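Ops channel
N.P.: pipeline sanity check, posting one input/output pair.
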């Protein structure tokens, strides 16, 4: 399996990070899982969870209305643009930040939290020492090689994604909502999902950016077997490099 990942990487012209956790026995399949990668929009999982964390202690929180102004729209706002001049609730922005990778949505949840640094401290509380968000959308998609900003390891995100969706990171109602947001993702058809059996159920969060950075983190629920948490990050040495969702799909095939 390590061999096939080495070859898929060499031929791909980029750098590939993978970490599959098999929750059956907590056994790991790792490849450059301790190297840093720009997270791009996979970072949005963190923001939405941080808001879900707040709702555990605050029952009016998810319903809070938030105004969407025309001054709020950025470069990619498939859902938030439909609510200009009106409002969206936090629950709705989190759904849209995760299901549609809406950048306007991401930016309203961060702002509600009070800064990218507020999302890092939340990651810290979970016990994620690696995760750092430093910028808002879309500039957290620059993904400059060696740039520490908005990065994390494949492993670190696998351990916290597993905790958030299958472990101690959130009380049940919150952990359930998060998972129902991840499963309903609309953007991941060509990434990790394309590499698995179709009958398997998948929650994921994609993320693409410059340097043909192409990411998908995911919880996979097989039909007869404990779940797996897979993180497939990928990035190239050339800034205008074409994203390669197909490479994440292949790595997924391999490891699983």
């Amino acid at each position: 399996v390590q061999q096939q990942l080495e070859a898929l990487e060499k031929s791909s012209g980029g750098r590939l990070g993978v970490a599959l956790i098999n929750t059956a026995d907590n056994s790991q399949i790792l490849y450059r899982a301790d190297e840093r990668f720009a997270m791009c929009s996979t970072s949005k999982v963190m923001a939405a969870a941080a808001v879900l964390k707040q709702s555990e202690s605050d029952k009016h929180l998810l319903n809070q209305r938030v105004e969407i102004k025309k001054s709020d729209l950025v470069n990619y706002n498939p859902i938030a643009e439909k609510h200009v001049n009106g409002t969206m609730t936090l629950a709705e922005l989190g759904a849209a930040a995760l299901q549609y990778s809406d950048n306007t949505a991401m930016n309203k949840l961060i702002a509600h939290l009070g800064g990218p640094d507020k999302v890092t401290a939340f990651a810290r509380s979970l016990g994620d020492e690696t995760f750092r968000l430093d910028r808002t959308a879309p500039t957290l998609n620059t993904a400059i090689p060696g740039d520490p900003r908005d990065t994390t390891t494949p492993l670190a995100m696998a351990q916290t994604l597993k905790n958030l969706t299958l472990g101690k990171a959130l009380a049940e109602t919150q952990r359930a909502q998060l998972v129902t947001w991840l499963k309903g993702n609309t953007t991941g058809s060509a990434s990790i999902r394309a590499g698995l059996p179709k009958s398997w159920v998948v929650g994921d969060k994609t993320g693409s950016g410059d340097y043909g950075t192409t990411n998908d983190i995911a919880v996979i629920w097989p039909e007869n077997h404990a779940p797996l948490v897979l993180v497939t990050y990928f990035t190239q040495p050339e800034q205008k490099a074409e994203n390669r969702n197909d490479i994440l799909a292949a790595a997924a095939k391999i490891v699983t």
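N.P.: looks fine end to end. Residues 73 and 143 are 22 Å apart (CA to CA).
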